[model samples]
Target: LPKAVVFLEPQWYSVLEKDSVTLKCQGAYSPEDNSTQWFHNESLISSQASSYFIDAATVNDSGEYRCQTNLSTLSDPVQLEVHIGWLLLQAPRWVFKEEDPIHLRCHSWKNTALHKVTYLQNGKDRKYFHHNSDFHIPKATLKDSGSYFCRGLVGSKNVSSETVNITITQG
Candidate 1:
């Protein structure tokens, strides 16, 4: 299989609020025969340029992203993170199939210490943590699919993050 590499500035998949970001995709051989295609969550967004630009980042920009070299070759996916609040919830991917594991993380942009994390899924609240804010689903089924969001407590305030809609597909 051919290795597709996406080039980005800062290397990390994170940008401050309203900050600009640029992504460049280069195939293992080349995109010389085809124009590069940029995708967010496996969906095409741009296909005319090798460089994908994000002007003024926001919470909605946080998700999985990748680039396509051609119709059959795709680069490794990259996660774009948004620092819109002191605490923000993150997911590796939004789309998945049954039996796939689901994972999420809570991040702090203001360097504040997190006391706890509460997850909201389908209007149900759950909490599980040791010292870090990480949520996981070992084996996902149809019932596991739903709307998800998280809240981080700095002391007592419910610092809520954005919701992540996940879809569980069939095999």
Candidate 2:
């Protein structure tokens, strides 16, 4: 059996409730069995296409997702976290290889402008932005692996997004 992989489009594994995301199955696509299988926390879903779309996610959508093609092995589960809050710390993905570019977003619901944005790693300050919500790392390394989150002032409300643990692997 061929091994399969599942990845997210837009690459973010965590998002605010009511947002959208797509999970794509990576397998050897053959003419004979191109259909895909999807599972959410070990329960099969009805999505047969190569991609599974969560057009409008809710807290209920938060779970482990996996996918497989008929000729391929089931992919390792990927965790999806959906939050009902005003702040969200989004990353391209949860895992990165060495030397990969890492990007992060400190976003607010409905595009609310965040002020005094502070990105934190393992409860320590990593970077700060005055008006920008985006943070960038030119390349990832093992040292970069840690729990990350962001805090900011949304108008008069001080808010912080849920912490997301990031892992870096050898390239």
Candidate 3:
């Protein structure tokens, strides 16, 4: 029996919101010779699966992923980079209301210096108050409520952050 080898491409990368991302792994050993399993942040995800499909990638999907096989004396680890295109900022299904200033932070799988960040409200553009870190809305109003998202422009490719559901209520 020959030893098995597995490899993951883009060893590290990011995916946008509501987008489908597939993690590919090739097993050098036959199905009967070895068993393969996928992991997210050191946790088991799938078994003997060539790809782990994310129908609509979300913020919860963000983490480091790897693969393990039974064919070898030791399992090899492959890093997976995930990004959320849109995120809901609600805490436990609760929404934000008027006069409530909201705070959010944006990050990327790759180097921060390689990307440009921007903020949006209800599909319209808004001023990005901060850079390379947290985004804040002081004294949020009714108009400031809606579905918000961030965009990271890396070269020509524009990767969006997670979509956040922002709501405003009366005092």
Candidate 4:
């Protein structure tokens, strides 16, 4: 199997909702390259262009992504997480096992004082606020399995971060 690689524009594996980004799978060609099979969390999508444009990106776009061709191999999977606004959530990892520690932080594109930080676990309110905007779970359990997301109030605007899915596998 060839070690093909997929490159995402804007470098980061993140984007804001309604924003635009590109996923390019280069370095491999020959099913002539124009026809590329793109996958979101291993699911096939309807984009055959070299530069797969994710226009008006949404939270549904959040997941592990990759690309491949008929003649070659699969490219490296890149996680694409779309946030609601300018805010972004940074985490140690997406998945965790039982009793594992989970940590997440909320930040903005621009460095500014955060008025408030909101953390959610599976669409339910989790944390209220942290001065440094960090959320931590010392021991993750089965109940901790859910989608984690964050948002913050910055400069009179509500900015949301991308979703991070956590699965608690039995240890």
Score every model by TM-score.
Answer: 0.59, 0.80, 0.42, 0.51
- Stretches off by above 4 angstroms in model 1 are 1-83
**Candidate order by decreasing lDDT:** 2, 4, 1, 3
lDDT by candidate, in order shown? 0.71, 0.87, 0.56, 0.74
For model 3, residues 1-27, the per-residue Cα lDDT tens digits are 333334433222445455556666554
Clashes by residue pair, model 4: none
Off by over 4 Å in 4: 31-33, 89-171
| lDDT of each residue in 76-135, candidate 4, tens digit only | 778777765567776645667888987667756544668678889889998897554578
Question: Which is superior by lDDT, 1 or 2?
Answer: 2
User: What TM value does model 4 have?
Assistant: 0.51
Better of 1 and 2 by TM-score: 2
Per-candidate alpha-carbon RMSD to the true structure: 6.4, 2.8, 12.6, 6.4
Where model 2 places Cα greater than 4 Å from the true spot, the runs are 93-100, 122-124, 140-147, 165-171
Name the better of 1 and 3 by lDDT.
1
Considering every candidate listed, which one attains the maximal lDDT?
Answer: 2
Best by TM-score: 2
Candidate 3's displacement at residue 119, Å, is: 0.1
Specify the poorest-scoring 10-residue window by lDDT in model 3.
Answer: 85-94
Q: Which ten residues in a row have the lowest lDDT in candidate 2?
A: 105-114
List of clashing residue pairs for candidate 3: 17-85, 85-161, 85-162, 86-162, 86-163, 87-162, 87-163, 87-164, 97-169, 98-169
After superposition of all CA atoms, the RMSD between model 3 and the true structure is 12.6
